[PDB]
Structure formats: C-alpha cells, structure tokens
Structure 1
Amino acid sequence: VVGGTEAQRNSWPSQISLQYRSGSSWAHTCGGTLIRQNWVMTAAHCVDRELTFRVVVGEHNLNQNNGTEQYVGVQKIVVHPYWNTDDVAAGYDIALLRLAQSVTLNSYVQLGVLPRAGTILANNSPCYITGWGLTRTNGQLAQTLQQAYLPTVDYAICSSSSYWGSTVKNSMVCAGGDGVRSGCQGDSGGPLHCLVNGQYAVHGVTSFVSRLGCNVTRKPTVFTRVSAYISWINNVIASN
C-alpha cells in the first residue's frame, strides 16, 4: 500500500498473508480474506505459480512474533474456471483456498463479511485497502499492516477514456486514483473493505494497478467485484 498509515492490530481480522516456501524460508506474496474457518478468498493470479503455499492468520508484523499468528497449509486451490493468466483485464481474478485445518476465531482472527450478490456501491463510497505490499512503486514490502482510505470510482467514470477505458469491466471495482494512495504489488488478492449499513464488508479482491506505477492519478487500483461472485463462492464451498 502506497500512501498508507499503519493499521492497529485488531483492526482488520479477516486479512491474511499468503506466503510461499522460498528455499528454507517463506515469503509473503499476496493478501487474502478469511471467509470460513477453513476457506480463504484471494486473487487467481496469486496462485498461478505451482508453489508451496501457506496462510498466516492474525498477523501484524511480518518479521516479528506478534504472539497472535496461526500458520496453516493450503490443501486445495479452486481458481475461477474462466480465469485466464494472459488476460487479467478479462476479469475472473478470484480463487478460493481450502485450508488444511480450521483456524481458531478470536479477536485477531475473524471471518470477513461478504456483500449481497449484485451490490454495486455509489461513486465515492468510503472504503479502505489493507495489505503488506510495496509502499512505493518499485519499493519494498511493508513490515506491518498498512491501510489507505480509498473511495470508490464508479464504473462509468472508471471505464471512461481518461481513466482505464475498456480494460476495466463491470465485474470489477475501481478505488482511489488520486496519485497519492493506492494498492501496490504484494497487496494483490487482499481486501477492499467498504462501510455499508454500519458494517465493513469485503467488496473487492485487489487485482491490478497500472503498468506505469502503483499510485498514478486517474489510474485507480482495480479490484475483482466480490458481489459478482457470490453464487460461485457458495457453490464451491458447498461442494468441497
């Protein structure tokens, strides 16, 4: 997250760190959202790589023991059937990971609330992006969770020519684009938390940023619209 501030520890308890084994160590590669005690929601581009992955829940500082972490392996990865690695602009950047064990819920570990199917937010809706991704374009990962206030940019504006044009589809959410704050690499797959009826719900899964850089004016961070996938999500969890 570019232009963020440090999140307090129990602020966003459904946020997970998706990591892969690198030699003898594990590196954070993407964010995710805990949606069931044994199911995490993330972007399908984060699991394109056949690597060994684990999920870290109740995490705050990646380089230090917080005393709250739970470490779990990934037992099954279910990527959206239409996801195409060579076309992220086509959408379908969503994946579900079945965890090897059920995690324990406590104040640091909670389930993310999903929106009702087909819900579309009004332009300029108050949302926050959270993650340990790069803090500057071509910079380094954050050590502690960062958060940035990133209001939505509706479809008509986001798909206009000054913004993203045709790259953005109606199955996506745009947020930010002020040239100061944004999602960045390493934030992918993580949540876009939006306040709806007094509750924060996860309306987006971080998908992409501009090729030109993370924080670029008129190039909001683009998210997979979670409300477009509620039936798919439920059909996967019910049969696996």
Structure 2
Amino acid sequence: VVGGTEAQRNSWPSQISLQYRSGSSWAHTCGGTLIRQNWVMTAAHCVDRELTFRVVVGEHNLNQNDGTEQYVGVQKIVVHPYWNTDDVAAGYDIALLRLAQSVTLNSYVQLGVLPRAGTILANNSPCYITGWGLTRTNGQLAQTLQQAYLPTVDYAICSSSSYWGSTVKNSMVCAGGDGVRSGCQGDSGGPLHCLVNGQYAVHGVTSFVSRLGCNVTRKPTVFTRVSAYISWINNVIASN
C-alpha cells in the first residue's frame, strides 16, 4: 500500500497473509480474505506458481511475534475456470484456497462479509485497501499491516480513455487514482473493504496496478468485483 497509515491490530480481522516456502523460510507474496473457517479468497494470479503455500491469520507484523497468529497449510487450490495467466485484463482473477484445518475465530480472526450478488457501488463510495505490499513503487514490503482510503471510481469513468480504457471490465472495481494512495505489489489478492449499510464488506480482490507504477494519477487500483462471483464462490464451497 502506497500512502497508507498503519492499521490498528483488530481493525481488519479477515485479512490474511499468503506466504510461500523460500528455502528455510516463508515469504509473504499476497493478501487474501478469510471467508469460512477453512476457506480463503485470493487472486488467481497469486497462485499461478506451483509453490508450497501457507496462510497466516491474526497477523499484524510480518517480522515479529504478535501472540495472535495461526499458521495453516493450503490443502486445495480452486482457480476460476476462465482465469488465463496471460490475460489479467480479461478478469476472473479470483481463487479459493481450502485450508488444511479450520482456524479458531477470535477478535483477531473473523470471517469477511461478502456483498449480495450483483451489487455495484456508487461512484466515490468509501472503501479502504489493506495489505503488507510495497509502500512505494519498486520499494519494499511493509512490516506492519497498512490501510489507505481508496474511494471507488465507477465503471463509466474507469473505462474512459484517460483512465484505464478497455483494459477494465464491468467484472472489476476501480478505486483510488489520486496519485498518492494505491495498492502495490504484494497487496494482490487482499480485500477492498467498503462501508455499506453501516457494515464493512469485502467488495474487491486486489488484481492489478499500472506497469508505470503503483500510485499513478488516473490509474486507480483494479480489483476483481466480488459481487460478480457469489454464485461461483458458493458452488465451490458447497462441492468441496
């Protein structure tokens, strides 16, 4: 997250860190959202490599013991059947991970609230991005979870030529684009939390930023629109 503020320890309890095994150690690569005690939602692109993955729930500082973490293996990866690694702009950047065991819920580990199917946010709706991703273009990961206020940009504006043009699809949410605040590498797969009827719900899965940099004026961060995939998510969980 570029231009964020440090998140409080108990603000975003559905956020997870998706990590891969790197020799003798584990490295954060993506975010995700805990959606059941044994299922995580993340970006398909985060799991294209055939690595060993684990999920950490209850994480705040990647590099220190917080006394709240639970570490769990990934038992099954279900990528959207239409995902194409070579065409991120086509969409379908969503995957579900079945965890090897159920996590324990507490004030640091809670399920994310999903929107109703088909829900579209008005322009300039209040949302926050969270993650441990780079804090500057071509910078370094955050140690502590960051948040940034990232209001939505509706499809008509986002798909206009001075924004993203035809690269964005109606199956995506755009947020931000002020040139100061954005997602960045290592935020991928994580949530966009948006306030609807008094409750934060997870409306986006972080998918991509510009090749020119993370925080680029009129190139909002782009998310998979979770409300486009409710039927798919429910079908996967019911059959696995």
Shared fold, TM over 0.5 = yes
Cα distance in structure 1, aligned partners of 2:147 and 2:159: 25
CA–CA separation in structure 1 for the residues paired with 2:59 and 2:11? 11
In the TM superposition, residue 9 of structure 1 has moved relative to its aligned partner by 0.1
Alignment deviations for residues 204-223 of structure 1 (CA, whole Å, 9 cap, x no partner): 00000000000000000000
Deviation at residue 227 of structure 1 after TM alignment: 0.1
String of CA shifts for 1:17-41, please: whole Å, max 9, x gaps. 0000000100000000000000000
Q: TM-score, normalised by structure 2?
A: 1.00
SS in 2 for 1:18: strand
Query: How far is the alpha carbon of 1:128 from its aligned partner?
Result: 0.1
Partner of 1:38: 38
TM-score, normalised by the number of residues in structure 1: 1.00
CA separation in 2, counterparts of 1:197 and 1:233? 23
Report the CA distance between 1:82 and its aligned residue.
0.1
Q: CA deviation at 1:52?
A: 0.1
Whole-Å Cα distance in 1 between the matches of residues 75 and 11 of structure 2? 28
SS of match in other structure, 1:97:
strand
* Aligned-partner Cα distance in 2 for 1:27–1:40: 18
Q: Deviations over 1:179-213 (max 9, x none)?
A: 00000000000000000000000000000000000
Q: Secondary structure at the match of 1:16?
A: strand
| CA distance in structure 2 between the partners assigned to 1:161 and 1:23 by the alignment | 45
Task: Write the distance in 1 (CA, Å) between the matches of 2:104 and 2:181.
Answer: 33
Q: Deviations over 1:85-126 (max 9, x none)?
A: 000000000000000000000000000000000000000000
Residue matched to 2:74: 74
Aligned residues: 240
**Secondary structure at the residue paired with 2:227?**
helix
* DSSP 3-state at the match of 1:210: coil
Runs of at least 4 residues off by over 6 Å: none
Name the CA distance, whole Å, in 2 between partners of 1:58 and 1:214.
27
- Structure 1: where are the runs of 5+ without partners? none
**What's 1:235 paired with?**
235
Following the alignment from structure 2 to structure 1, what is the Cα–Cα distance between the partners of residues 55 and 158? 32
Distance (whole Å) between structure 2 residues aligned to residue 204 and residue 8 of structure 1: 21
User: Superposed, which structure 2 residues align to 1:94-113 within 5 Å?
Assistant: 94-113=94-113
Per-residue deviation, 1:224: 0.1
Gaps of 5+ in 2: none
Q: Displacement of 1:144 after TM fit?
A: 0.1
Give the Cα–Cα distance (whole angstroms) in 2 for the partners of residues 183 and 174 of structure 1: 11
CA RMSD of aligned residues (A): 0.1
Over residues 146-180 of structure 1, what are the superposed CA-to-partner deviations in whole Å (9 max), with x where a residue is unaligned? 00000000000000000000000000000000000
Give the drift of 1:138. 0.1
Percent identity, please: 100
